[PDB]
UniProtKB/Swiss-Prot annotation, chain A:
Job of this protein: DNA-dependent RNA polymerase (RNAP) catalyzes the transcription of DNA into RNA using the four ribonucleoside triphosphates as substrates.
Organism, scientific name: Thermococcus kodakarensis (strain ATCC BAA-918 / JCM 12380 / KOD1) (Pyrococcus kodakaraensis (strain KOD1))
Keyword Ion transport included in the entry's annotation: no
HAMAP family with a match to the protein in the record: RNApol_arch_Rpo6 (MF_00192)
InterPro entries: DNA-dir_RNA_polK_14-18kDa_CS, Pol_omega/Rpo6/RPB6, RPB6/omega-like_sf, Rpo6/Rpb6
Main location: cytoplasm
UniProt xrefs under NCBIfam families: PRK01099.1-3
Reactions the enzyme catalyzes: RNA(n) + a ribonucleoside 5'-triphosphate = RNA(n+1) + diphosphate
Protein name (database record): DNA-directed RNA polymerase subunit Rpo6
From Swiss-Prot, chain G:
Cellular localisation: Cytoplasm; Chromosome
Family: Belongs to the RNA polymerase beta' chain family.
Native organism: Thermococcus kodakarensis (strain ATCC BAA-918 / JCM 12380 / KOD1) (Pyrococcus kodakaraensis (strain KOD1))
Gene label: rpo1C
Transmembrane portions of the chain: none
Domain of life: Archaea
Protein name according to UniProt: DNA-directed RNA polymerase subunit Rpo1C
Subunit structure: Part of the RNA polymerase complex.
Function: DNA-dependent RNA polymerase (RNAP) catalyzes the transcription of DNA into RNA using the four ribonucleoside triphosphates as substrates. Forms part of the jaw domain.
Record lineage: Archaea, Methanobacteriati, Methanobacteriota, Thermococci, Thermococcales
Length: 56, 122, 181, 620, 42, 91, 73
């Protein structure tokens, strides 16, 4: 039902990189930091649209 | 090659192309990039507007009917027949001159008679 | 002559465009990647007609964007050798005649015009035959046959088609029609 | 767009001829001391190395320009030294005239089916390879050439023979020519190659006999300026030097023997080009005695560092980085809507101040050096999409390293906390994983750039995520020395801290407002604080644990447990109840590394945010 | 699939460490310290 | 940053971080691999176009990002009449 | 594994098959990498040192994860 650590790190990195190259961020408005922490807070709210397709 | 792989292709008349080109043109009305047609595409449209001897639908119908008329009339040849609209035996000759099979005067008249319909009248 | 292509490819949808339906978006990218180009195999890519279906998105380590397996429709144009075509004279020059037969032009040499001695009228914009008073100028409609194709670059304006009207059943429509009797 | 696989094999003549940019025919180099450009071996549409851009259609100046291959039409076929033993093992295992593997139908059927059961193990496939070899080598009646008596082969270094028959009881040895051998390998069908060590598509046997020699690009043959010519080039010069002589002698008159001598000479030269350190092959030396080192000798033959100082006043995952080091090490941050203001203030502060920057990278990619000029007109309409290299900020992801790097715990992700002076500050409990002390030990500091890398380190390598060692089921990051002594004094029978001490010092941790500090257990002697209660002010309200302390020994072992099947009159068997320290004293048993009983429990049950807190507040 | 395999597709170990519990996450070798989990009943 | 220093990132599992430190910040070279061939294709300035050896201009080749060392290795193996057919795998 | 106890290096585990590249940089091994490569038959991968020597993300760690995200909207 959950993610593995490696998958978490991977997803976070991906979203952060998406945010760097542009791409508006979902619900965040009052912040003041890097794309990494933006993706990190986004993850703390479980709104990161990145899904891990597991081979099974 | 266009893209990774080509899965399907079809030979298309000028009339059908006229409709598709007009769509592409009308699609712009595209707002965010507007997306104008490049020059030769605009030229192709103009030529298509002028040389489309049939309406989009009657051109398709004629193309299908010519294909079912003989085995030696494939989709490309039928499309060419619809673009040219041969009137008599001379016109049939030059169309099939460099083709696989040369139609006898009899079967040539069969094609002409089929194409004797659909002719724009006006 | 035209052709309809149904092709499955892979499109990379930029992150800056996640605010647009994948069909529309991938359509844009594809249009900006293929339209205006002569693919030697298929020919002049006129336009991406549409995007039928698109697969799931996949992110690759390094890029961050989204790669999808899309399927789309395009309209192309290939001028095969010895193909019979009809067109309109769109340019007059002292050495030849360019005839619009589609998205490109087809050059016809002055020695491949008519069964008669042809000279280029300098003062005007036309070709004139000595014996037969047949004249060809700007805006004239003709029927010719491709005799050679020079496919250099993918740039449509660098490739050149050669044609001739020096064959039975070719040339201006008035000639064709008047000769039948 | 990345490499799935690589499939090795053997190059066909066709490939070498097609992948060539031009046919090399003139055996010469540069020549000489002025104007280094010829028409055979040097840049004749082949490759660029001097500050002159002309090349093979691709133009591509000397700067950035992948070398192009060439070819050499060998006047005669030449056995490849690398396959010599393999070619031999092939020749005397198969039939001449035939093309069969000298095996019965049965043998092939059951062999291939024993060859698929081994199709991955390189070591165990050779046993059966050589076994097959010897089983065919003993026969002389193949099932695909009416049998014609096979004259056994001889070899080496590159010569072959066949002890044929023509007389009767004789055993004369017919010599073997590369042309013969190659044309004899071209008969062996694709069906038989799998039963050997070859491929029908990837590695045909005939290709083992070179008909065309591929010439390395200019880029792979750079000239070592003082010019010290490249060895490969020289040996190649000799090879073409004989090749042309051979072809010129074949086209003219043919005394046969002459062609044989020249052929074998060419063979020598190619043999040397492939491997100069070969066996049975006189090393082609340069005019000095120093051997040429060819192909077989060719594929053969943002950080910082400083002293460390302790700091039990920073978070356990934090690292103290000298602000000077922070002003040298920079991070690539693309300007977006949330940091637009920050980065603009940073770049405006210039390479000076403290929160400044050194470089700026616009979307085109051109790097801008903020030194010269001024931070004025540079820091203008930046627009989104640019990139600022700002100085290290408090909180940035950073790798801390101490060599030697035994276990993985030697490299851990930390959080920069910029401080003056000139050393790295390491919180004390993170000393066991690094195996660092202080006397003079120095450590490394890494600053990752791509967001993916930073995140990955911050999510997976952060200090707090590795309190427990993978070697044994226990915590590695914990109390060292004073932490142990302090835990003891704090949790002693006679531990009574006056208000002055408790109140003022709990600020080294936190957690009070209402129902935490309450209520002063002892007002007997005086209103005072029992140490057990003060310690109790940290553990969560549900961990009940009990384990004997270090002193639970000798005749002081005792016991007197009592299960639940409240007062307090115990000492040894440490009893903690819902945060309340009932009995016990803190020591090496209680805290510290290696152990496995308390710090262990709070990290399994509550792993990240809590574990770090209990650790951080306890030291102080 | 919870299996330790060599890079050439060779099952070196059907389920890692027999039980599949990471030694960094096990209670001193034990695959879930049972005596501890039971006590946790309050 | 050598052997054990590689093995630490491996142990944690930080792949991106490895590449990040040992390649991406040095000499990253991009070469074009043919799909059905396996042999590195060929660009061309002056004309601006690709074309692999065996397959002629017509065939769509794919880009591959790699350390220059391996390109040099492919070249060396190829000069030794060995074919390192590159089996691509899709994006 | 393999049916018999073998040493952990060179004449055993490190000595066996992996991919050519895991023995290609096997320290200047004439009689090895020269021998292994002189036999051109096949080649796989999905190893570890092969991918780092080539410039690829190692298939361990995160490398064994694949992302996916529908882009509307
Ligand atoms: Mg020490
Ligand atoms: Mg020390
Ligand atoms: Zn070049
Ligand atoms: Zn035989
Ligand atoms: Zn190719």
């Amino acid at each position: 039902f959950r993610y593995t650590r490696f998958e978490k790190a991977r997803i976070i990195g991906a979203r952060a990189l998406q945010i760097a190259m542009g791409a508006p961020v979902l619900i965040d408005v009052p912040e003041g930091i890097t794309p990494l922490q933006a993706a990190l807070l986004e993850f703390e709210k479980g709104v990161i649209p990145i899904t891990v397709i597991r081979p099974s | 090659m266009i893209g990774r792989k080509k899965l399907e292709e079809h030979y298309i008349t000028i009339a059908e192309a006229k409709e598709l080109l007009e769509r592409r043109h009308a699609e712009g009305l595209a707002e965010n990039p507007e997306e104008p047609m490049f020059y030769e595409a605009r030229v192709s449209l103009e030529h298509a507007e002028r040389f489309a001897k049939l309406k989009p639908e009657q051109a398709r119908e004629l193309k299908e009917k010519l294909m079912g008329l003989f085995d030696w009339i494939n989709e490309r040849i039928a499309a060419k027949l619809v673009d040219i609209l041969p009137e008599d035996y001379l016109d049939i000759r030059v169309i099939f001159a460099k083709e696989e099979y040369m139609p006898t005067p009899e079967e040539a008249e069969e094609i002409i008679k089929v194409i004797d319909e659909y002719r724009p009248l006006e | 002559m035209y052709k309809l292509l149904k092709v499955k490819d892979v499109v990379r949808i930029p992150p800056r465009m996640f605010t647009m339906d994948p069909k529309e978006a991938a359509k844009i990218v594809l249009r900006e990647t293929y339209e205006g180009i002569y693919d030697r195999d298929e020919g002049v890519v006129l336009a991406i007609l549409d995007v039928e279906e698109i697969s799931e998105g996949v992110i690759v380590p390094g890029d961050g964007a989204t790669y999808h397996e899309a399927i789309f429709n395009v309209l192309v144009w290939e001028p095969r050798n010895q193909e019979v075509v009809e067109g309109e004279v769109v340019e007059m020059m002292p050495y030849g005649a360019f005839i619009r037969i589609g998205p490109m032009d087809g050059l016809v040499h002055i020695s491949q015009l008519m069964d008669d001695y042809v000279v280029f009228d300098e003062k005007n914009r036309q070709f004139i035959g000595k014996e037969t008073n047949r004249v060809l100028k700007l805006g004239d409609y003709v029927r010719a046959r491709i005799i050679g194709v020079s496919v250099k670059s993918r740039v449509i304006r660098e490739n050149k088609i050669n044609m001739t009207m020096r064959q039975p059943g070719l040339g201006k429509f008035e000639w064709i029609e008047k000769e039948k009797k | 767009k990345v490499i799935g696989s690589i499939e090795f094999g053997i190059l066909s003549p066709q490939e070498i001829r097609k992948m060539s940019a031009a046919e090399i025919t003139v055996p010469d180099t540069y020549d000489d001391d002025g104007y280094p450009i010829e028409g055979g071996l040097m840049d004749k549409r082949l490759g660029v190395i001097d500050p002159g851009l002309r090349c093979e259609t691709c133009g591509a100046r000397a700067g950035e320009c992948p070398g192009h291959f060439g070819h050499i039409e060998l006047a005669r076929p030449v056995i490849h030294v690398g396959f010599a033993k393999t070619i031999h093992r092939v020749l005397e295992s198969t039939c001449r005239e035939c093309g069969r593997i000298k095996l019965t139908d049965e043998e092939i059927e059951e062999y291939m089916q024993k060859f698929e059961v081994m199709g991955d193990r390189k070591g165990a496939v050779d046993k059966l390879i050589k076994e097959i070899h010897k089983k065919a080598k003993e026969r002389m009646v193949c099932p695909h050439c009416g049998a014609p008596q096979f004259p056994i082969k001889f070899e080496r270094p590159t010569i072959y023979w066949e002890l044929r028959k023509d007389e009767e009881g004789n055993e004369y040895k017919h010599r073997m020519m590369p042309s013969e051998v190659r044309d004899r390998l071209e008969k062996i069908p694709d069906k038989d190659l799998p039963l050997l060590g070859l491929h029908p598509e990837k590695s045909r046997p005939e290709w083992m006999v070179l008909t065309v020699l591929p010439v390395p690009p200019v880029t792979m043959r750079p000239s070592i300026t003082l010019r010290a010519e490249d060895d490969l080039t020289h040996k190649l010069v000799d090879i073409i030097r004989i090749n042309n002589r051979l072809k010129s002698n074949i086209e003219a008159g043919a005394p046969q023997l002459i062609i044989e001598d020249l052929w074998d000479l060419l063979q020598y030269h190619v043999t040397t080009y492939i491997n100069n350190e070969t066996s049975g092959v006189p090393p082609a030396k340069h005019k000095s005695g120093r051997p040429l080192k060819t192909l077989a000798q060719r594929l053969k033959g943002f950080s910082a560092r400083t002293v460390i100082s302790p700091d039990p006043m920073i978070s356990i995952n934090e690292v103290g980085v000298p602000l000077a080091v922070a002003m040298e090490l920079t991070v690539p941050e693309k300007v977006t809507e949330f940091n637009y203001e920050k980065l603009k203030q940073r770049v405006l502060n210039g390479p000076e101040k403290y929160p400044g920057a050194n470089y700026v990278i616009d979307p085109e990619g051109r790097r801008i050096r903020l030194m010269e000029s001024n931070r004025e007109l540079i820091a203008e309409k930046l627009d989104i999409g640019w990139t600022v290299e700002r100085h290290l900020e408090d909180g940035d992801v950073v790798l801390f390293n101490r060599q030697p790097s035994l276990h993985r715990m030697s490299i851990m992700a930390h959080r920069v906390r910029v401080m003056p002076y000139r050393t790295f500050r390491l919180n004390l409990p993170v000393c066991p994983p690094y195996n660092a002390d202080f006397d003079g030990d120095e450590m490394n500091l890494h600053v990752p750039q791509t967001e993916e890398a930073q995140a990955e380190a911050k999510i997976l390598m952060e200090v707090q995520n590795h309190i427990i060692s993978p070697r044994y089921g226990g915590p590695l990051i914990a109390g060292i020395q004073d932490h142990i002594s302090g835990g003891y004094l704090l949790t002693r029978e006679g531990a009574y801290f006056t208000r002055y001490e408790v109140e003022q010092m709990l600020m080294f941790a936190g957690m009070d407002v209402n129902e935490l500090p309450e209520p002063d257990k002892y007002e007997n002697g005086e209103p005072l604080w029992s140490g057990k209660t003060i310690f109790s002010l940290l553990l969560p309200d549900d961990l009940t644990i009990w384990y004997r302390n270090k002193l639970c020994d000798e005749p002081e072992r005792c016991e007197a447990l009592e299960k639940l099947i409240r007062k307090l009159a115990y000492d040894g068997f440490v009893y903690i109840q819902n945060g309340k320290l009932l009995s016990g004293a803190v020591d090496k048993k209680a805290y510290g590394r290696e152990d496995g009983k308390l710090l262990d429990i709070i990290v399994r049950e509550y792993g990240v945010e809590r574990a770090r807190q209990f650790l951080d507040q306890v030291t102080k | 699939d919870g299996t330790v395999r060599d890079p050439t597709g060779i099952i070196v170990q059907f389920k890692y460490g027999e039980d599949g519990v990471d030694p960094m996450k096990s209670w001193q070798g034990k695959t879930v310290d049972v005596d501890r989990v039971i006590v946790r009943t309050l | 940053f050598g052997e054990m220093e590689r093995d630490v990132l491996i142990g944690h599992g930080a792949a991106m971080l490895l590449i990040e430190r040992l390649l991406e910040e040095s000499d990253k070279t991009e070469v074009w691999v043919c799909e059905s061939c396996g042999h590195l294709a060929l660009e061309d300035k002056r004309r601006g176009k690709v074309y692999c050896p065996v397959c002629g201009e017509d065939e769509r080749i794919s880009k591959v990002e790699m350390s220059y060392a391996f390109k040099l290795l492919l070249d060396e193996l190829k000069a030794m009449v060995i074919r390192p057919s590159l089996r691509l795998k899709d994006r | 594994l393999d049916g018999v106890i073998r040493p952990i290096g060179r004449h055993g585990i490190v000595g066996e098959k992996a991919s050519v590249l895991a023995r290609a940089a096997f320290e200047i091994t004439t009689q090895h990498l020269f021998a292994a490569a002189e036999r051109g038959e096949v080649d796989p991968l999905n190893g570890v040192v092969e991918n780092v020597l080539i410039g690829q993300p190692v298939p361990v760690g995160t490398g064994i994860v694949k992302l996916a995200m529908s882009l509307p909207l």
